[PDB]
């Protein structure tokens, strides 16, 4: 799970739409446009026979795919708390109107958010300017901060890249990328025909890292580290 | 009395073997046996026959009653009669188990023999169940069980006798 | 052969066995009585216990105090041996729960007969007919429940009937082990657990 | 033609010889006629059914097994008739009152690997199939006619003992009067009617089999399959049971044109897992007898979780439960233990809930966010088949006799949270809605997981960390406030444990020393629950009384010193909670009485909850 | 449909046996006497005891229970012969004389769960609770038609699958003579019988673990057509039958099963010397009854006294001007968690007659009052009574009363104020009787009672609703160590108790049909606390005493009412739970009447008035 927090006009939404375009089984949703019920699962009278029936929400429909949540901080707390079970336990348990069952929601959540006031503050830590709480912050394996600080040489290079992009895409780092068709084929082959297996990972290194990362997190208060960061290490290696 | 002890008494029954060894007459306390001549029949107790078969020293012959037609006739007679019919041996079930488990190679149609003896056993156990139920229901003080075998009695007799002891005391508790 | 066997119950006979744990436990069960004479100092247990007072006390104590002319006390039957419950037993003996109503139903009922109640004949016939009614189901379940959970079969049986049930189970298991050839092996005794 | 009857006769004879001749064992040990013996014992017990193994039948005669697989409906009735014959010749003679021979239900089981519900495709119609699933619904048991007789209204011409085909298929009454001449009137259009007194009927039941949760394709809802059960398969399962069904895939035979509704006629049920074999039984006696059974159980609770030993011990007490009681005046006292885990994230609360739901003999997991008052306790709704209001059980009803694992317990609405007060304390659900007025049973433990009001406990805040009411909090026997402690050696050991845990996933799942497998501990909990109800000993009760009074005085003085009410109250329900915990500890050991040691351990566990209060 | 042929030889043998049983003259004459009373009371159903039939003829009893229909028609024909022998004039008044059955039926005692298809055609005794009744509708059994053209009368008699007859019968209503003339029905000369369907449901406490209660449909005819109403716990003896149906040339083998009842028994409320001795021997029998009321709950003496007053009830007054005063007493308990409010409510549910359980979140207004449902027999919409309607002349126990919605409490306003509920639904606008006492239990807002807030804001309910309750008790978990010691001693003693028929290690059994006779088989201080079984009968006899108010007690009540008004004046706005009003005076009259009922005095004395004033003082003036 990934959280992109940061300033306006820093291509967070463009990243989310790219992941939507490239990935199979992508669900895109935004802020107030989502609900707890709509995200997870919903119960309705069946349209013709009128018995209560359970129905798939976004997280269930993305069960082996990606759920993309733009404007993540703009959601309601009641809507945002619905995704905890799907984020960690990878299930959605519903007990409503005689239905008592758990659905599979094994998706990857990629969220985009703004800090408080719409501008990240280096005077403060992430926990001090995000407005999210520890249970949801800890559920994101990768936690990115994107800033729009002034830097003239980088601004010049970025401007040249952007204007060149507008030239290249008219209707008519160094390393070179793959074509996107080839990348899609590569992705699905890598996901379905290949399965990594961990033999060893030099446990002392990661254990000591986690121990003093916990110490510094307790010192500064910047981010809770819990136990999930260890398992995030294993997941990222795989 | 245990089923193993009933088997111990069944083991005293005489069966015919064909030795592959030569041995003069042996004067056992329970009666002399032999001489043992290779290739000829000789009649010996079942424990000795089974031991010699296990030690590969003889070929066991089926008893005269271990024949499929004879056993079918006995089974049908048992199924038709209401009382226990006379059995071909007083330890026929034990004989069947011992001989067929240790000498099925020697005894042809052993599957048919085992199934027919099982049929006779089932019929006679059903008759014994009927006898016990009738005894308790009609409050008998005596029953006649002439053709039952020891294993057949011993299967149910401890339970039945205990029940009848309790029944007797219940029907005589007003005696003083 | 030389296994342990407890002293057998004598509760169905004219008197119970002195050394029988089953008879001791059976005679501990309480019996309703009325005091026909006052008992000094006994109000500490239930000052005197007054004359004509109703009590429920153990069967052993009632048998000790009772006499045929009722000087110390007079005895009432428990309700399960009175005419109301006798009729329920007469309806169908197989559906009643003699574990609740006992667990020593027959033994306790047999020992009630020594109080010279006018309905001793009815009690005796009731006990005998209850046993006759329940015999077939005890026999069938004991002799045909093999290598399974017998608790459902044993639940509603009184201690005498449960003893008979275990006897039938022993016979069944003995024959089945013989048939499967497991009776041949020499085994460490049940004390081998420690 | 009658050559078909000749084929039927020889096939029935071959089934009869299978049931007469099949044996298991070896000549070195001994032989037992498996199906003869089972027929005899079941008939004498009054059971009138047997279960045949497809592999045994195939070993005896593979053609019969192939015929049963391809054409189960045709050949199963021959097998059942042969079973009736063998039952007769195995049980004859019978006592009085048992002279009339009974029909035998032959059930089927196999060692073959099962198919999925989504494997059932049109190529397999009328074939014998084996599939797994979960029972999610079960109808009332009702009567299906197996034999009828029909009489003509004009001439009283009677057809006797008409064989009714099994399953959801019906029967067509003859269009015109049979075997007599076309007189005057020739026929009223339905000449026949079913005679009321001559019908022979058997029990039948309808169930819904849901696809297993791990069999569902990604993004799809689980599929449903209707099941027809018959005779002794009725009430053999309940909703919530995991089953492997053996049955005939078939169409009902009385959206689209040529559409036919399908179902499985169940021929055998294997509950995946009301009985313990004597070997399991005596092993459970041994396990209760050994002196450190409490520690062994606690180490068996969630073995993949590092630490949390007191929490695991309290969970063991919750799994075993106290003893339910009814007092002389008719009032009931709760036996189940309610436990709340409350605090920091990433502390394995959800993993403990997921373990307990799988380890408890009866267990359901639900999220607090995803639940409602009706869906938790019980719901009222109208049935499209008949316009009347019916009840449908919620989580509490489905978990009656076990545990409800309510994850995300702080997330549920307050109006939904007040629904479970009666079901938590009184263990009943009183409904008075739409004219139906009743009181259902909900005898189940609540194991709840929740976070702080501020995510982490944030120790300066104190009582402001809790938004739960004193009413709901007093209904929890133990309230484990769980705080993620940052200690360096603890973190190193925990990280090495987690890394080894992830590494060891490929190690073929080998057995382990000093703990109980989950499948065994589940059965052991069930055995102890059904067998043992302890009580307090007198001296133990005195100890508990005095300690309770001391704790009450301490709680009062703490609240007075604070000049504010604590969120966790110390009440008479907490006294009874200590009593229940002591009884659960004794029930682990199958002891009829709880000792001072059990009371001391119960007080030790409860004083963690009292630490959480003060 | 419905006609079946029987073997005449066995029919005559059975009829001979049953007539021998009924001709009881040489013996005690029990059934001679019972048939005499059947004639004398203008009855035509005899209730026979199968215990007596087993004593006289055991095999005939067994065949009766296992072959119900043929044996029952044989028995009814024997009964008609015997009643003709006693009184031949009376025997011709009725077409048929019926026999119902009582006693012990052995294994045929069942519940709706265990009542399987194996019991078809057997006599079964089903114990359960009534959940539905249909409307009583007539059923034609024998119709006479007059042919005006031919000037002759034909008479036809009918049957259906429900009504197996053992005589030739039709199922078509005629409209034409054999000469094709029209026929005119003679309704007065025709015979019709009442017919009703009810549903008996399994007792909820006896259901297995994960299961909802099961149901069986029961058909009641003749005198039995209104012998049970919804909410009654009943035992129905009858014949279990299936109804083979057909639908247009085809039949699904699924047949619905019904119990055709032959006897219906209530299981509630069912000599005077013990009660007379008690009331004369005891001093303040009210105190002994109140403290004996709920033994497993320590303390709460005044609340127990108030609940005893609720159980005994006041007296209902109707005045010459049509104004009305209720007799029912309403009690509200507001209190902290774990102060036994729910257990007191559960005690009243277990011991009072017609005590209906209810909870705030489990109920709705419709379920509280009445619902529209469709009669499955007919299809027409009609009313189905809710909880407070079922609780008429009884109690409704509302736990979690603060958790209830105001829209639901709107119904409770009308029920408490006027003893009725008015409805306008289905085809019917009607005024249903709901004359029930209310025993409500609630928590204060914020869960625990707050000492630093007024009682009228600790109590979350509005004063308009609070005016309805006669008494309002505040129950606080005072943490006094003395009370803690004695309470914990009592609680641990209760938790150490075990029942007599139960072994030391036994876990609590789940229920089953352990009642195996239609009447109780085993059948005043405890084994000097009063016994519960005696106290039920005592309260039953005391409820009907109807004592009159006396002048000196009236003067005392007037003096103390005015004094309580002055105390209300002097009380601060934090020192009262409720204001004092004319309804406080009415409460005093009701409580004094209940105390008089407890004494069985037939006159309200100063003794009663004193306790009434003390109880009202205790309830009203607290903080
Ligand atoms: N580094 C960049 N390279 C290229 N385009 C960029 C870059 N940063 C921003 N943009 C452009 O800026 C525009 C806005 O992108 P967008 O993704 O909507 O910003 P954002 O991260 O979503 N800010 P917000 O929506 O307020 O949270 C797009 O047209 C992007 O292409
Ligand atoms: N002590 C532990 N041992 C092993 N795994 C652990 C431990 N603590 C946490 N984890 C892991 O951390 C992850 C989160 O566990 P989880 O059960 O959700 O804890 P939680 O307290 O319920 N989190 P939350 O729902 O935010 O409160 C899982 O992958 C666990 O395996
Ligand atoms: N004074 C008491 N004596 C005996 N048992 C008591 C007493 N007070 C409480 N209990 C016990 O405490 C438990 C809870 O009682 P309960 O009936 O729920 O009180 P309550 O106030 O209605 N609970 P609540 O619904 O949260 O207000 C029961 O097992 C009672 O027996
Ligand atoms: Mg954006
Ligand atoms: Mg969690
Ligand atoms: Mg309550
Ligand atoms: Zn015809």
Q: Distance between CA atoms of C45 and C56, rounded to whole angstroms?
A: 12
Scan for tokens 């619904």, then name that residue. D137
- Backbone φ and ψ for E237, nearest 5 degrees, come out as -100, 130
Question: How many other CB atoms are there within 10 angstroms of residue C105's CB atom?
Answer: 26
On whether the CB atoms of residues E538 and E278 are closer than 8 A, the answer is yes
Residue-wise DSSP of E225-237: GGS--TT-EEEEE
On whether the CB atoms of residues D468 and D569 are closer than 8 A, the answer is no
- Residue D132 bridge partners (DSSP): D244
Distant-in-sequence, close-in-space partners of B92: CB < 8 Å, separation ≥ 6: B65, B117, B120, B149
Rg (CA), chain B: 20
- Backbone φ and ψ for D171, nearest 5 degrees, come out as -145, 140
On whether the CB atoms of residues E195 and E221 are closer than 8 A, the answer is yes
On whether the CB atoms of residues D34 and D50 are closer than 8 A, the answer is no
Q: Please state whether the peptide bond connecting residue C138 to the residue before it is cis, i.e. omega within 30 degrees of 0.
A: no
Q: What angle do CA A196, A200, A206 make, to 5 degrees?
A: 110
CATH number of B67-175: 1.20.58.1020
Q: Is the alpha carbon torsion for A4, A7, A11, A13 positive or negative?
A: positive
- Considering only CB atoms, B166 lies closest to which of C136, C160, C168, namely C160
On whether the CB atoms of residues A111 and A140 are closer than 8 A, the answer is yes
Q: Distance between CA atoms of D536 and D547, rounded to whole angstroms?
A: 15
On whether the CB atoms of residues E419 and E434 are closer than 8 A, the answer is yes
Beta pairing, strands D158-163 & D142-152: antiparallel
Give the burial class of A147: count Cβ atoms within 10 A of its Cβ; 0-12 exposed, 13-18 middle, 19 or more buried: exposed
On whether the CB atoms of residues E260 and E99 are closer than 8 A, the answer is no
Q: Which of D288, D218, C134, D40 is nearest to B123 (CA)?
A: D40
Distant-in-sequence, close-in-space partners of C191: CB < 8 Å, separation ≥ 6: none
Q: Please state whether the peptide bond connecting residue E430 to the residue before it is cis, i.e. omega within 30 degrees of 0.
A: no
Q: Which of C54, C92, C98, C125 to probe by mutation at the E interface, max E CB count within 10 Å?
A: C92
Torsion of CA E383, E386, E392, E397, to 10 degrees: 180
Q: Distance between CA atoms of E58 and E63, rounded to whole angstroms?
A: 9
Scan for tokens 């303040």, then name that residue. E284
On whether the CB atoms of residues E200 and E218 are closer than 8 A, the answer is yes
How many structural domains compose chain C? 1
Q: What angle do CA E266, E271, E275 make, to 5 degrees?
A: 110
Q: Is the alpha carbon torsion for E58, E63, E69, E71 positive or negative?
A: negative
On whether the CB atoms of residues E18 and E78 are closer than 8 A, the answer is yes
- Contacts of E583-587 spanning 24+ positions with Cβ under 8 A: E583/E467, E583/E470, E584/E616, E584/E620, E585/E557, E585/E561, E586/E325, E586/E470, E587/E329, E587/E470, E587/E471, E587/E616
Coil, strand or helix: which one is E289? helix
Considering the domain boundaries, does residue C61 fall inside one? yes
Q: Distance between CA atoms of D416 and D406, rounded to whole angstroms?
A: 13
Q: Distance between CA atoms of D189 and D191, rounded to whole angstroms?
A: 6
Considering the domain boundaries, does residue C186 fall inside one? no
Q: Distance between CA atoms of D592 and D535, rounded to whole angstroms?
A: 6
Q: Distance between CA atoms of D43 and C140, rounded to whole angstroms?
A: 10
Beta pairing, strands E420-425 & E428-433: antiparallel
Three-state helix/strand/coil letters over chain C: CCCCCCCCCCCCCCCCCCCCHHHHHHHCCEEEEEECCCECCHHHCCCCECCCCEEEEEHHHHHHHCCCCCCCEEECCCHHHCHHHHHHHHHCHHHCCHHHHCCCHHHHHHHHHHHCCCCHHHHHHHHHHHHHHHHHHHHHHHHHCCCCCCHHHHCCCCHHHHHHHHHHHHHHHHHHHHHCCCCCCCCCCHHHHC
CATH number assigned to the domain with residue range D279-614, chosen from the 4 options 3.20.20.70, 3.40.50.300, 3.20.20.370, 3.90.1010.10: 3.40.50.300
Q: Whose CA is nearest to atom 14 of ligand 2?
A: D346
Q: Give the tokens for residue A31.
A: 């802020």
Method: cryo-EM
Q: Give the tokens for residue D346.
A: 């990433």
* Domain extent for C97: 2-181
Burial D176-197 (b: 16+ CB within 10 A, else e): ebeeeeeeeeebeeebbbbbbb
Considering the domain boundaries, does residue C191 fall inside one? no
On whether the CB atoms of residues D346 and A231 are closer than 8 A, the answer is no
Cα-Cα end-to-end distance for chain E: 74
Coil, strand or helix: which one is E357? strand
Q: Distance between CA atoms of D420 and D446, rounded to whole angstroms?
A: 9
Question: How many other CB atoms are there within 10 angstroms of residue E190's CB atom?
Answer: 16
On whether the CB atoms of residues E545 and E597 are closer than 8 A, the answer is yes
Distant-in-sequence, close-in-space partners of D51: CB < 8 Å, separation ≥ 6: D38, D106, D107, D108, D109, D268
Ligand 1 centre to CA of A39 (Å) is 25
Contact D275 C140 (CB under 8 A): no
Q: Distance between CA atoms of C103 and C123, rounded to whole angstroms?
A: 17
**Which residues 60-99 of chain E have a CB within 8 Å of chain D?**
69
Nearest CA in chain D to C176: D32
Distant-in-sequence, close-in-space partners of E183: CB < 8 Å, separation ≥ 6: E145, E146, E147, E154, E174, E175, E176, E177
Q: Give the tokens for residue D278.
A: 């004597």
CA E23 vs CA B114, D49, E62, E79: distances in Å: 62, 47, 20, 9
Q: Distance between CA atoms of E419 and E422, rounded to whole angstroms?
A: 10
Considering the domain boundaries, does residue C188 fall inside one? no
Q: Give the tokens for residue A7.
A: 């300033």
Beta pairing, strands D24-26 & C73-75: unpaired
Q: Whose CA is nearest to atom 4 of ligand 3?
A: E297
Residue-wise DSSP of E25-66: TTTT-HHHHHHHHHHHTT--EEEEEHHHHHHH-HHHHHHHHH
Note the Cα C73 to chain centre separation in Å: 24
Contact C181 D30 (CB under 8 A): yes
Ligand 2 atom with least separation from CA of D352:
17
What 8-state DSSP symbol labels residue E445? T
Q: Where are the domains of chain B?
A: 1-66, 67-175
Q: Distance between CA atoms of D140 and B60, rounded to whole angstroms?
A: 62
Distant-in-sequence, close-in-space partners of A196: CB < 8 Å, separation ≥ 6: A238
Secondary element (H or E) of residue E491:
helix E481-496
What 8-state DSSP symbol labels residue E162? S
Q: Distance between CA atoms of B8 and A221, rounded to whole angstroms?
A: 85
Residue-wise DSSP of D260-328: --EEEEEEEEEE------HHHHHHHHHHHHSTTHHHHHHHHSSTTS-S-HHHHHHHHHHHH----EE-T
Secondary element (H or E) of residue D217:
none
Beta pairing, strands E137-147 & E152-157: antiparallel
Q: Distance between CA atoms of D220 and A55, rounded to whole angstroms?
A: 9
Q: What angle do CA C135, C136, C137 make, to 5 degrees?
A: 95
The alpha-carbon gap from D45 to the nearest alpha carbon of chain C, in Å, equals 6
Distant-in-sequence, close-in-space partners of B37: CB < 8 Å, separation ≥ 6: B19, B22
Residues of E in Cβ contact (< 8 Å) with C25: none
- Residue B33 bridge partners (DSSP): B26
Cα-Cα end-to-end distance for chain D: 89
Coil, strand or helix: which one is D193? strand
On whether the CB atoms of residues E137 and E195 are closer than 8 A, the answer is yes
Class of domain B1-66: alpha beta
Contact D431 E367 (CB under 8 A): yes
Q: Give the tokens for residue D230.
A: 């018959």
Substitution site in A227, A228, A229 for ligand 2 pocket (most atoms within 8 Å of beta carbon)? A227
Ligand 2 atom with least separation from CA of D353:
17
Ion ligand 7: residues, CB within 5 A, are D 152, 154-155, 157, 177
Coil, strand or helix: which one is E522? coil
Question: How many other CB atoms are there within 10 angstroms of residue D359's CB atom?
Answer: 21
Q: Distance between CA atoms of B45 and B11, rounded to whole angstroms?
A: 7
A84 alpha carbon, closest ligand: 2
């Amino acid at each position: 799970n990934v959280l992109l927090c940061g300033d306006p006009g820093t291509a967070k939404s463009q990243f989310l739409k790219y992941i939507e375009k490239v990935s199979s089984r992508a669900i895109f949703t935004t802020g107030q446009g989502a609900s707890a019920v709509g995200l997870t699962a919903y119960v309705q009278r069946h349209p013709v026979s009128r018995e209560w029936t359970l129905e798939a929400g976004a997280l269930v429909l993305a069960d082996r795919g990606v759920c993309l949540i733009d404007e993540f901080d703009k959601m309601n707390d009641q809507d945002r708390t619905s995704i905890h079970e799907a984020m960690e336990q990878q299930s959605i348990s519903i007990s409503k109107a005689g239905i008592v069952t758990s659905l599979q929601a094994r998706c990857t959540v990629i969220a985009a958010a703004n800090p408080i006031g719409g501008r990240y503050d280096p005077s403060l830590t992430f926990s001090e300017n995000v407005d999210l709480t520890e249970p949801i912050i800890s559920r994101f394996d990768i936690l990115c901060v994107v800033r729009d600080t002034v830097d003239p040489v980088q601004d010049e290079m970025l401007a040249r890249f952007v204007v060149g992009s507008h030239v290249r895409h008219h209707p008519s780092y160094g390393v070179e990328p793959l074509p996107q068709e080839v990348l899609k084929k590569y992705i699905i082959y890598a996901k379905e025909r290949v399965h990594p297996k961990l033999n060893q990972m030099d446990q002392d290194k990661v254990a000591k890292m986690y121990s003093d990362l916990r110490k510094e997190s307790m010192a500064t208060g910047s981010i809770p580290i819990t136990v999930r960061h260890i398992e995030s290490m294993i997941r990222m290696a795989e | 009395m245990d089923a193993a002890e009933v088997e111990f008494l069944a083991e005293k029954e005489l069966v015919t073997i064909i030795p592959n060894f030569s041995l003069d007459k042996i004067y056992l306390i329970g009666g002399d046996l032999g001489p043992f001549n290779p290739g000829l029949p000789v009649e010996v107790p079942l424990w000795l026959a089974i031991n010699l078969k296990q030690r590969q020293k003889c070929r066991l012959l089926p008893p005269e009653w271990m024949d499929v037609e004879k056993l079918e006739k006995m089974r049908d007679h048992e199924r038709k009669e209401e009382t226990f019919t006379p059995m071909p041996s007083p330890y026929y079930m034990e004989l069947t188990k011992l001989l067929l488990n240790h000498a099925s190679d020697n005894i042809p149609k052993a599957d048919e023999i085992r199934t027919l003896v099982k049929d006779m056993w089932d019929t006679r156990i059903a008759k014994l169940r009927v006898s016990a139920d009738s005894f308790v229901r009609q409050q008998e003080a005596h029953a006649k069980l002439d053709n039952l075998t020891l294993m057949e009695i011993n299967t149910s007799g401890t339970f039945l006798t205990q029940a009848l002891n309790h029944m007797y005391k219940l029907r005589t508790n007003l005696q003083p | 052969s030389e296994a342990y066997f407890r002293v057998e119950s004598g509760a169905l006979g004219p008197e119970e066995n002195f050394l029988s744990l089953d008879d001791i436990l059976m005679s501990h069960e309480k019996l309703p009585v009325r005091t026909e004479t006052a008992m000094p100092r006994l109000g500490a247990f239930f000052n005197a216990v007054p004359q004509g007072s109703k009590l429920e006390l153990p069967l052993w104590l009632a048998k000790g105090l009772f006499d045929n002319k009722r000087r110390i006390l007079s005895v009432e039957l428990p309700k399960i041996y009175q005419e109301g419950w006798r009729t329920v037993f007469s309806a169908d003996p197989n559906v009643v729960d003699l574990h609740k109503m006992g667990p020593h139903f027959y033994g306790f009922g047999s020992q009630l007969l020594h109080f010279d109640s006018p309905e001793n004949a009815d009690i005796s016939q009731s006990l005998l007919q209850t046993f006759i009614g329940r015999f077939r189901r005890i026999m069938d379940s004991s002799q045909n429940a093999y290598n399974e959970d017998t608790s459902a079969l044993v639940a509603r049986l009184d201690e005498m009937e449960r003893g008979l049930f275990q006897t039938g189970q022993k016979g069944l298991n003995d024959f089945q082990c013989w048939e499967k050839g497991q009776a041949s092996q020499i085994t460490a005794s049940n004390l081998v657990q420690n | 033609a009658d050559e078909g009857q000749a084929r039927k006769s020889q096939l029935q004879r071959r089934f009869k010889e299978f049931l007469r001749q099949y044996r298991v064992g070896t000549d070195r040990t001994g032989f037992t006629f498996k199906y003869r013996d089972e027929l005899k014992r079941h008939y004498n017990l009054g059971e009138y059914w047997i279960e045949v193994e497809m592999e045994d039948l195939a070993s005896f005669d593979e053609d019969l097994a192939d015929y049963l697989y391809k054409q189960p409906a045709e050949h199963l009735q021959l097998l059942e008739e042969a079973a009736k014959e063998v039952a007769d010749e195995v049980t004859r003679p019978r006592p009085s009152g048992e002279e009339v021979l009974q029909d035998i239900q032959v059930m089927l089981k196999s060692d073959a690997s099962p198919s999925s519900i989504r494997s059932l495709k049109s190529d397999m119609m009328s074939h014998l199939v084996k599939i797994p699933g979960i029972i999610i619904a079960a109808s009332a048991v009702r009567a299906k006619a197996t034999r009828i007789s029909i009489q003509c209204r004009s001439c009283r011409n009677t057809l006797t003992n008409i064989a009714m085909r099994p399953g959801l298929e019906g029967y067509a009454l003859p269009r015109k009067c049979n075997t007599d001449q076309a007189g005057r009137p020739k026929c009223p259009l339905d000449p026949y009617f079913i005679m009321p007194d001559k019908c022979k009927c058997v029990d039948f039941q309808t169930l819904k089999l849901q696809e297993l949760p791990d069999a569902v394709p990604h993004g799809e809802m689980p599929r449903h399959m209707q099941l027809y059960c018959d005779r002794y398969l009725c009430d053999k399962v309940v909703p919530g049971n995991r089953v492997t069904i053996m049955g005939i895939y078939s169409i009902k035979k009385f959206v689209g044109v040529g559409i036919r509704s399908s179902y499985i006629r169940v021929l055998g049920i294997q509950v995946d897992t009301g009985a313990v074999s004597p070997q399991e039984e005596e092993e459970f006696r041994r396990l209760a007898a050994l002196p450190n059974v409490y520690e062994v159980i606690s180490k068996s609770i969630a073995p993949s979780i590092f630490g949390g030993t007191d929490m695991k011990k309290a969970i063991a007490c919750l799994l075993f439960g106290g003893s339910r009681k009814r007092l002389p005046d008719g009032l009931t006292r709760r036996g189940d233990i309610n436990l709340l885990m409350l605090g920091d994230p990433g502390t394995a609360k959800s993993q403990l809930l997921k373990f307990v739901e799988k380890c408890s003999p009866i267990g359901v997991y639900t999220s607090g966010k995803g639940s409602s008052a009706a869906g938790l306790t019980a719901s009222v709704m109208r049935d499209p088949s008949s316009r009347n209001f019916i009840m449908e059980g919620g989580a509490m009803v489905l978990a009656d006799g076990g545990v409800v694992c309510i994850d995300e317990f702080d997330k549920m609405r307050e109006d939904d949270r007040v629904a479970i007060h009666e079901a938590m304390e009184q263990q009943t659900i009183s409904i008075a809605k739409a004219g139906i007025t009743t009181t259902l049973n909900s005898r189940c433990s609540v194991l709840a997981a929740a976070n702080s009001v501020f995510g982490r406990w944030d120790e300066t805040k104190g009582e402001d960390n809790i938004d739960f009411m004193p009413t709901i909090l007093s209904r929890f026997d133990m309230i484990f406030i769980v705080k993620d402690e940052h200690n360096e050696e603890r973190d190193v050991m925990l990280a090495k444990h987690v890394i080894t845990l992830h590494v060891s996933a490929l190690t073929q799942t080998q057995a382990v020393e000093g703990e109980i497998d989950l499948a065994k501990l589940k059965k052991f909990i069930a055995y102890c629950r059904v067998k043992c109800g302890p009580r307090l000993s007198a001296e133990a009760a005195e100890k508990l009384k005095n300690r309770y009074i001391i704790m009450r005085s301490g709680a009062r003085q703490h609240e007075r010193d604070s000049d504010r009410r604590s969120s966790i109250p110390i009440t008479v329900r907490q006294l009874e909670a200590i009593v229940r915990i002591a009884e659960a500890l004794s029930k682990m050991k199958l002891q009829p009485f709880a000792t001072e040691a059990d009371v001391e351990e119960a007080l030790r566990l409860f004083q963690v909850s009292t630490l959480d209060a003060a | 449909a419905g006609t079946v042929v029987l073997d005449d030889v066995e029919l005559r043998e059975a009829q001979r046996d049953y007539l021998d049983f009924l001709d009881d003259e040489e013996d005690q004459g029990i059934y001679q006497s019972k048939v005499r009373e059947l004639i004398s009371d203008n009855q035509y159903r005899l209730i026979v005891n199968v215990n007596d039939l087993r004593r006289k003829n055991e095999k005939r009893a067994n065949r009766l229970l296992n072959n119900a229909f043929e044996e029952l028609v044989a028995f009814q024909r024997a009964l008609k012969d015997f009643v003709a022998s006693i009184d031949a004039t009376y025997a011709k008044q009725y077409e048929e004389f019926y026999v119902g059955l009582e006693g012990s039926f052995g294994s045929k005692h069942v519940s709706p769960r265990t009542l399987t298809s194996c019991f078809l055609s057997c006599v079964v005794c089903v114990e359960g609770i009534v959940t539905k009744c249909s409307l009583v509708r007539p059923k034609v059994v024998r119709s006479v038609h007059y042919c005006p053209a031919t000037k002759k009368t034909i008479e036809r008699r009918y049957s259906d699958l429900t009504t197996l007859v053992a005589f030739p019968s039709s199922s078509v209503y005629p409209t034409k003579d054999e000469e094709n003339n029209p026929l005119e029905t003679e309704y007065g000369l025709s015979v019709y019988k009442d017919h009703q369907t009810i549903t008996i449901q399994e007792m909820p406490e006896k259901a297995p673990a994960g299961q909802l209660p099961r149901s069986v449909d029961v058909i009641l005819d003749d005198d039995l057509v209104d012998k049970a109403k919804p909410g009654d716990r009943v035992q129905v003896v009858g014949t279990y039958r299936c109804l083979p149906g057909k639908k247009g040339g085809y039949t699904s083998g699924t047949f619905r099963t019904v119990l055709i009842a032959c006897n219906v028994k209530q299981m509630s409320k069912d000599i005077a010397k013990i009660k007379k001795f008690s009331k004369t021997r005891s001093k303040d029998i009210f105190d002994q009854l109140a403290k004996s009321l709920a033994p497993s709950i320590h303390g709460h003496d005044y609340v127990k006294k108030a609940i005893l007053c609720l159980l005994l009830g006041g007296v209902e007054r109707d005045l010459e001007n049509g104004s009305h005063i209720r007799g029912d007493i309403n009690i509200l308990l507001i209190g902290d968690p774990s102060v036994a409010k729910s257990q007191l409510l559960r005690y009243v549910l277990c011991t009072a007659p017609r005590a209906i359980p209810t909870t705030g979140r489990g109920s709705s207004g419709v379920g509280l009052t009445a619902a529209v449902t469709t009669d499955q027999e007919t299809g027409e919409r009609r009313l189905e009574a809710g909880a407070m309607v079922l609780a008429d002349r009884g109690v409704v126990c509302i736990d979690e009363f603060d958790k209830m919605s105001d829209m639901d409490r709107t119904a409770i306003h009308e029920v408490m104020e006027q003893g009725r509920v008015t409805i306008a639904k289905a085809g019917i606008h009607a005024r249903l009787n709901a004359r029930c006492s209310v025993l409500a239990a609630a928590n204060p807002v914020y869960g625990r009672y707050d000492q630093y807030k007024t009682p009228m804001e600790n109590i979350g309910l509005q004063d308009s609703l609070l005016s309805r309750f006669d008494l309002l008790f505040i129950m606080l978990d005072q943490m006094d160590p003395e009370q803690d010691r004695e309470i914990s001693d009592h609680v641990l003693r209760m938790h150490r108790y075990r029942a007599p028929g139960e072994q030391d290690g036994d876990a609590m059994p789940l229920g089953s049909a352990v009642d195996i006779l239609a009447t109780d088989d085993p059948n005043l201080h405890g084994t000097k606390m009063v016994s519960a079984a005696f106290m039920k009968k005592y309260i039953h006899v005391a409820k009907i005493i109807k004592p009159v108010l006396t002048q000196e007690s009236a003067t005392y009540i007037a003096e103390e009412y005015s004094r309580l008004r002055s105390q209300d004046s002097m009380s601060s706005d934090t020192a009262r739970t409720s204001p004092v009003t004319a309804r406080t005076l009415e409460t005093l009259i009701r409580l004094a009447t209940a105390h008089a009922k407890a004494r069985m005095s037939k006159t309200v004395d100063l003794q009663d008035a004193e306790e009434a004033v003390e109880l009202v003082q205790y309830a009203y003036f607290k903080k």
